[PDB]
Design a protein around this ligand. Structure first.
Ligand SMILES: Cc1n[nH]c(-c2ccco2)c1CCCCN(C)c1ncnc2nc[nH]c12
Ligand SMILES: Cc1n[nH]c(-c2ccco2)c1CCCCN(C)c1ncnc2nc[nH]c12
Lengths: 208, 208
């Protein structure tokens, strides 16, 4: 069963801007996604201090970057807190509305797309390089879900039947045809070194 | 009743480094504290989406900066999630241990004190400008506490009998005698504009 949802108009507008604006410094998408993973790992680490059983779904706290040239995907995997169905459908869009509005206002005032992270919507920078984004996620209090959007104003959520994850999130970037450089080992290494070198979790770049 | 606690050796070492190192760009302390307030406000905002009664202790989400020349204090006030007694005594130091270690290693490798925020211990940058820091805090699930430390390897916690806060945190910086510029309106304005201009909560700088 796949459910289809409309983005609120503001988030749809943001996705369109991200897709439509001429902006060459696209590499910043990876810093934003890795930062998101780091925050999610901080969150589960913090919560387990008071309830250690929150780690029964997996003790290791890490980030994997997985390129696949055949699928043309770059997958950012974390074993963080994960997202509930309510996050995917309601909570996250509610928070995003005001960040979007502030980001938009900053842009007209001369701010730069690379500042998107300050407005809490850095995830959407994924659309600088991806035609479609699939998010597979599992939170302790909930089932494993697959969220997906190619923009165009809608997203889907379904219960995921793929490989069970234990706990955490995979962001699967289905790259635009002209953005395959982000599958290349030395390009990904370069970006992580430049933007993410102090992340406090091991980041493993898988080799193809 | 005042309880006195020893910092773990690593955090004590970090505080000493922050106090002892020659480093002129001290203004970064305010960005770190405002960023901390912002995160705490994000946290309560997020939690109230699923439990709106979490805001019964106060709906407004904001940050006040309050200079007092007579007391020689700069107070950063937020109406964020606040901190529990377990945070003050156990949880926060546990998380801080590994951030401290990474920060230390980054420094020897040539990183800069201004990067302290990437290691999740930016609060301690308060000691660049303050001889004593007092933290008054109230979390929904707990009583109002006062934490205090002048470094030297220990901190105290007591139940606070001052003005009840509703919910949130006040960081009261008892400034070093040579650091009173941070009580001056135009200096604080300058710093906020430079480092904190996109914080998604109203920041009110009180006038003396
Ligand atoms: C599916 C979705 N819907 N709306 C958003 C969103 C809203 C604002 C920014 O992103 C998203 C994406 C949310 C991404 C950031 N996040 C909240 C995350 N939470 C938990 N573990 C994560 N590991 C990577 N990121 C994670
Ligand atoms: C009292 C104490 N003990 N150990 C630490 C600490 C550990 C690592 C960084 O700071 C602190 C300070 C913690 C400061 C950051 N924080 C966790 C905060 N939590 C909730 N509302 C806040 N409003 C400002 N900040 C807030």
């Amino acid at each position: 069963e796949v459910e289809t949802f409309a983005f609120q108009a503001e988030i749809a507008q943001l996705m369109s801007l991200i897709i439509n604006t001429f902006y060459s410094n696209k590499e910043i998408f990876l810093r934003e996604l890795i930062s998101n993973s780091s925050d999610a790992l901080d969150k589960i680490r913090y919560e387990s201090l008071t309830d250690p059983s929150k780690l029964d779904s997996g003790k290791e706290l890490h980030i994997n970057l997985i390129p696949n040239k055949q699928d043309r995907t770059l997958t950012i995997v974390d074993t963080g807190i994960g997202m509930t169905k309510a996050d995917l459908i309601n909570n996250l869009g509610t928070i995003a509305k005001s960040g979007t509005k502030a980001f938009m206002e900053a842009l007209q005032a001369g701010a730069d797309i690379s500042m998107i992270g300050q407005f809490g919507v850095g995830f959407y920078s994924a659309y600088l390089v991806a035609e479609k984004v699939t998010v597979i996620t599992k939170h302790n209090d909930d089932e494993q879900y697959a969220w997906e959007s190619s923009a165009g104003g809608s997203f889907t959520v379904r219960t995921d039947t793929g490989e069970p994850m234990g706990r955490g999130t995979k962001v699967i970037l289905h790259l635009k045809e002209d953005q395959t450089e982000y599958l290349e080992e030395r390009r990904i290494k370069e970006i992580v070194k430049k933007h993410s070198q102090f992340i406090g979790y091991p980041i493993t770049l898988f080799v193809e």
